[PDB]
Amino acid sequence: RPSSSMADFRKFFAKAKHIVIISGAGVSAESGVPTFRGAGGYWRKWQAQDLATPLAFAHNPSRVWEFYHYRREVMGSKEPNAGHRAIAECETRLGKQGRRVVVITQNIDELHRKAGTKNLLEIHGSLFKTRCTSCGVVAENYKSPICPALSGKGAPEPGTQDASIPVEKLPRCEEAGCGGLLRPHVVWFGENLDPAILEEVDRELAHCDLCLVVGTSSVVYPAAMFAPQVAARGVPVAEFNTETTPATNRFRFHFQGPCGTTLPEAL
Template sequence: MSSDVESFTAHLQSSKRILALLGAGLSASSGLPTFRGAGGLWRSHDATSLATPEAFNADPVLVWQFYSYRRHMALKARPNRAHLALAELARRNPDFMTLSQNVDGLSQRAKHAPEKLQLLHGSLFNVKCTSFYCSYQAENFTDPIVPALAIPFDASDPTTKDAVEERREMDISDVDIRLPSLKITDLPKCPECHQGLLRPGVVWFGESLPSKVLNTVDTFINDSSKIDLILVIGTSARVYPAAGYVDDARAKGARVAVINADPEDIPAGGLGDKDWFFEGDAAQIVPDILKSVIGEIEQPTERLQ
């Protein structure tokens, strides 16, 4: 391990153009439940069936309740040292770009430079109007986004609120509550056209990835300069376009460094003799292996907003 760190550090210090590809394993280090691992009341639902345009059209109330829960959980979590380390690398390196498959807003809250952070799957904290005639979209970190979507409590049980609050502090992935009945008029409306419903600005199953993001990434990769290094953090990178970005970076000369808690999670193209695999918690490993160029990263004691 020490020799791997030494060889990685030597390469990092000579690297100019760097890519980072992020997956759910990075946010797991912040204690955030994965998309398919949502706890509490959502254990009885198939989360993937709620993440489609068809589901929103059929039952926007249920879909918004699910995404309001996910927004709340993401805001309860804190950016970890790996988020902070990558944000610091973005500040120090003009030719660094992060491609994130995460929608939890933790990189943004770590103050990662927006122009160096490409959100492949959108964000829980972007909202956009569903009206065909309206192009409104905005960033929104308000929790709840409208009062009706607040995490509810059982008013008939005076102990429920305290119990839920205690459980939130212990385990943010488990909120055991009942869903209230809401009307469509209770859901967030577009502040611009005042007609359309707002929807979460995430990429749902069956939707295309954002073309602006894809074009920005392609421009970076296809630049005439070589790519020195790609960091693959908390993702297997076996699904496209993620897998393709690893291959593209390697074709431009990049060496690959994988940071993952699962030793089986390696990119589809495998690892070469000159690549690295660092097994363990990304929140610990990423700041350590980047320390020679970004300095020491401490976990802040205050919650980042």
């Protein structure tokens, strides 16, 4: 069934008054941005599903920041693409017209935010946000590097050497009289989700009259808990992906290829 109609699609898109846009790894990967919870591209000597766990920060905090210094870093040179932008501009327009567009995004790169998207829901946090592991405070952090110690430390290559920066040298909360060890405020495997962020997610799913999916779909994680709700209520689901045919899900629309291509036109 999954219609291939940018025709009718453009019909509902003109009709619908509260669009919710679930964003995917793909959207970020079309930029220049490094996926790791991905097929290949390990980061040095370890699995990245394996560095991004709470016990990693427990056994070597140093070499995890090592992993996220890099992350934070690499994106100095990466930009929002035509997808990030189509979506942004579409938000603005109908914004003053008189309609809500929302963007739900598992990604942590903040590329949507650079593109000018105001309604963002990053359901894994940002790697430009820190959490003090002591007085769980949260904070925009953009400093390059994050800690003098980490300057030059983080090398992509393998057989790179460790770093083993004494905890005390790692990122430390500036909160007056705290100084606990800073971690990345980014949802880890085994880790759960901002329940607030979820009750808004779920909120914008009951009230949405148009739903979009881009990058990584309803068949593949992290993206699923959101596909099911839309279909039952009686609401159309356009899926925009780069995954040719391999799949386990279908709905009112599917399109193909980069969302650089498609989206600009669509929205």
